[PDB]
Amino acid sequence: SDRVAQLTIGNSTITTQEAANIIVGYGEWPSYCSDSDATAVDKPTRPDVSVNRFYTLDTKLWEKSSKGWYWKFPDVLTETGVFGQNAQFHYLYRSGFCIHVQCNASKFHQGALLVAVLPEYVIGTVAGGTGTEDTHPPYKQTQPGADGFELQHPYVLDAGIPISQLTVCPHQWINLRTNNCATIIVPYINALPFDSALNHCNFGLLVVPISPLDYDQGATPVIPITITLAPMCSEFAGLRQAVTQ
Amino acid sequence: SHENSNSATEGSTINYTTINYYKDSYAATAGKQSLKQDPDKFANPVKDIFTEMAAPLK
Amino acid sequence: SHENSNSATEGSTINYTTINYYKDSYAATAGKQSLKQDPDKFANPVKDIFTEMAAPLK
Amino acid sequence: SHENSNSATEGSTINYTTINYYKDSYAATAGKQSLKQDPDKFANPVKDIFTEMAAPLK
Amino acid sequence: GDRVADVIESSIGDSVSRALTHALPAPTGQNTQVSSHRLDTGKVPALQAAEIGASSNASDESMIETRCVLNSHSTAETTLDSFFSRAGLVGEIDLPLEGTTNPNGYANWDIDITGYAQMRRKVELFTYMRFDAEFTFVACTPTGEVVPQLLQYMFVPPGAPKPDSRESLAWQTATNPSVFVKLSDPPAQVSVPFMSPASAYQWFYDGYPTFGEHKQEKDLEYGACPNNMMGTFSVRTVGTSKSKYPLVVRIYMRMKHVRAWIPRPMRNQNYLFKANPNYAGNSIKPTGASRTAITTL
Amino acid sequence: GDRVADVIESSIGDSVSRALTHALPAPTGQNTQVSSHRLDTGKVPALQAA
Ligand SMILES: CCO/N=C/c1ccc(OCC[C@@H](C)CCN2CCN(c3ccnc(N)c3)C2=O)cc1
Ligand code: NA
Structure with missing residues (x-):
């Protein structure tokens, strides 16, 4: 009765029988931009059901040695369905998201993943190892698209900051003996009312094992982690031709 | 003082008590801020709030 | 302050809020000016004003 | 002055008359202290007080 | 309807x-x-x-x-203003006589306070911050000696002409705000408003400033947000002939009227560059101290 | 006299031993009441937790 849940939005429904409640980031729900916060004058377009729905974008395999992954929003969706098309045809975009990370196992497997959302997740490089070289992350690393990207140094989140403090950001844990999913609702976060869905990634989704996956020989060894997400209150403005980047 | 409203905190959920001798309010002192706090925004952003006495997962 | 009225703007269609410590008002600060505007004087000095919706020459 | 109450004597049995120009009260002057005295605390801390005229031990 | x-x-x-x-x-x-x-x-x-x-x-x-x-x-004492409204060093400008840097009696400093770790680590605790600030300029020789020299500080917002010499026409400063002061005078000090085009400055921008292919050669622009670039601070000795003394200008900043959003993990690896969070990969150190066993102090 | 709160609100000294049970008159064996068939879910008298 807090362990069970149903998420319905658009023409999509998600069910879970081992949930751990729902997190509403920074304590507030997604909402459309008000007339006083807005600055752009064209009347926006709010597609509703055709874009605010659940998209299942990717599946990763959790292994005893996995270091962790991250995805960028709205990057993961810029090339998917009707949401992607609007993001490409418009200069301005804004929305929130309902993120549902899925991972189930058996009562004999163990392990815990930390699922967190970190706004403005700027990636850094190891600087040629010695730190004397000002190298920079390539486009495929800063905006990895739907496949996501694997962390090289999870302890410092590939950005010189302690993952041990990542819990100061909206999160949930997927601890196999307890739940099989994490659900986080995130409002629009930015210093501007609208922005480019292409040039700016508002936040990153981090899925990192903190307690390694373990099980005895004989138990199903393939333990997938699937990422499903839904845009909420999507708004678009500044129409012209489609642009991919 | 009938000055300009050009402070970084004009229209804040916390009122300040400041000193100033110029027509521009950002020139004012830092003063004292309001002592309001909202830990829950970070420590407890759950949709369905659970009591202390109860078992968090039931 | 009961001073002299020797400012360049004494008798202006815009009132100012200034500071001064001398008997001569031109020594005063620039203060704040009134925010009135009249674009039409330059952007639309036509005798017979024409509406937006209409055709300017009919 | 609506300042902070951070003086070493905030909540004392002796009121002070001080000057200050800052938001923190400990920055204030020493002022004047109250002229109350209690010699008995040291010169006569006896349980059963004995009169002057009488013989202290009877 | x-x-x-x-x-x-x-x-x-x-x-x-x-x-x-x-x-x-x-x-x-x-x-x-x-x-x-x-x-x-x-x-x-x-x-x-x-x-x-x-x-x-x-x-x-x-x-x-x-x-x-x-x-x-x-x-x-734990309010944002209590924590941040304490002036710290954020810039240093050298005006030497004999030199490789600025031997021509003038210098242009891009307004970027991320070159000093103490201040930087405090502000990077938050993602977005909106504030006014009080700037103080302390000047002397490299020995800390006070000399009878007149200086000119000028704020050059984006788009205004940056002086290219001690005698640049730009020093006429007809619209830019300038401060004239002697090293013998106390440190100059002014109040600066919140000047960004955005509602807040942001210490992290996970994106690019422009559209297009983001090929290797342009990857230095990843994380560059013009909304944080407030301009240039120019300083010169006021004269047509070289100054007689070598000078140094230290820049202090005291934020006031602060608001901040989105707290984040605090830096635990040494900083290397102003523009990014790059860390030395061969020296990834634990956030804090270590011990020999988990069962021993 | 007493003044600190924990002293005023303590139960130290309560000589009234609280009793969870009380005696009832029972001069005869209990009677038996008519009962009929019950086919319920939720109700399970036959199951115990010794
Ligand atoms: C005579 C005239 O005297 N004029 C003095 C004067 C003083 C200061 C001044 O502007 C001060 C600007 C600071 C308040 C904020 C600096 N900021 C904003 C965020 N930011 C960032 C954000 C992200 N990455 C990096 N690297 C940097 C950054 O560095 C203008 C003029
Ligand atoms: Na952008």
Whole structure:
């Protein structure tokens, strides 16, 4: 009765029988931009059901040695369905998201993943190892698209900051003996009312094992982690031709 | 003082008590801020709030 | 302050809020000016004003 | 002055008359202290007080 | 006009962001209430489900028998202004006589306070910050000696001509704000407003400033947000001939009227560059101290 | 006299031993009441937790 849940939005429904409640980031729900916060004058377009729905974008395999992954929003969706098309045809975009990370196992497997959302997740490089070289992350690393990207140094989140403090950001844990999913609702976060869905990634989704996956020989060894997400209150403005980047 | 409203905190959920001798309010002192706090925004952003006495997962 | 009225703007269609410590008002600060505007004087000095919706020459 | 109450004597049995120009009260002057005295605390801390005229031990 | 039901009953357009929490006045630490022994079934404060993502709601009163304590310890010194409104070094400008850097009696400093770790680590605790600031300029020779020299500081916003010499026409400073001061005078000091085109400055921008292919050669622009680039600070010795003294200008900043959003993990690896979070990969060190065993102090 | 709260609110000294049970008159064996067939879910008298 807090362990069970149903998420319905658009023409999509998600069910879970081992949930751990729902997190509403920074304590507030997604909402459309008000007339006083807005600055752009064209009347926006709010597609509703055709874009605010659940998209299942990717599946990763959790292994005893996995270091962790991250995805960028709205990057993961810029090339998917009707949401992607609007993001490409418009200069301005804004929305929130309902993120549902899925991972189930058996009562004999163990392990815990930390699922967190970190706004403005700027990636850094190891600087040629010695730190004397000002190298920079390539486009495929800063905006990895739907496949996501694997962390090289999870302890410092590939950005010189302690993952041990990542819990100061909206999160949930997927601890196999307890739940099989994490659900986080995130409002629009930015210093501007609208922005480019292409040039700016508002936040990153981090899925990192903190307690390694373990099980005895004989138990199903393939333990997938699937990422499903839904845009909420999507708004678009500044129409012209489609642009991919 | 009938000055300009050009402070970084004009229209804040916390009122300040400041000193100033110029027509521009950002020139004012830092003063004292309001002592309001909202830990829950970070420590407890759950949709369905659970009591202390109860078992968090039931 | 009961001073002299020797400012360049004494008798202006815009009132100012200034500071001064001398008997001569031109020594005063620039203060704040009134925010009135009249674009039409330059952007639309036509005798017979024409509406937006209409055709300017009919 | 609506300042902070951070003086070493905030909540004392002796009121002070001080000057200050800052938001923190400990920055204030020493002022004047109250002229109350209690010699008995040291010169006569006896349980059963004995009169002057009488013989202290009877 | 509207007529189909799904349109009349939709929530499309609701600009009122519903909030699950609200702030409360908390001028002092919470008090402690008397508590006694509890031997119950059903009631279990000590048990939590950290998976939910919330922090423990268990309190002293429910874990041990407590006395009453009237706590009057203030919470005033931990406000944003209390923490940030303390001036720190954010810039240093050299004006030497004999040199490789600025031997021509003038210098242009891009306004970027990320070159000093103390200040930088404090501001990077938050993602967005909006504030006014008081800037103080301390000048002397490299020995800390005070000499009778006149200087000119000028703020050159983006788009205004940057002086290219001690005698540049730009020093006429007809619109830019300039400060004329002697090293013999106290440190110059002014108030600066919040000047960004955005509602807040942001210490992290996960994106690019422009559209197009983001090939290798342009990757230095990843993370560059013009909304944070306020301009140039130019300084010169006021004269047509070289100064007689070598000078140094230290720049201090004291934020005031501060607001901040989105807290984040605090830097735990040495900083290398102003423009990014790059860390030395061969020296990834633990956040803090270590020991030999988990069963020994 | 007493003044600190934990002292005023303590139960130290309560000589009234609280009793969870009380005696009833029972001069005869209990009677038996008519009962009929019950086919319920939720109700399970036959199951115990010794
Ligand atoms: C005579 C005239 O005297 N004029 C003095 C004067 C003083 C200061 C001044 O502007 C001060 C600007 C600072 C308040 C904020 C600096 N900021 C904003 C965020 N940011 C960032 C953000 C992200 N990455 C990096 N690297 C940097 C950054 O560095 C203009 C003029
Ligand atoms: Na952008």
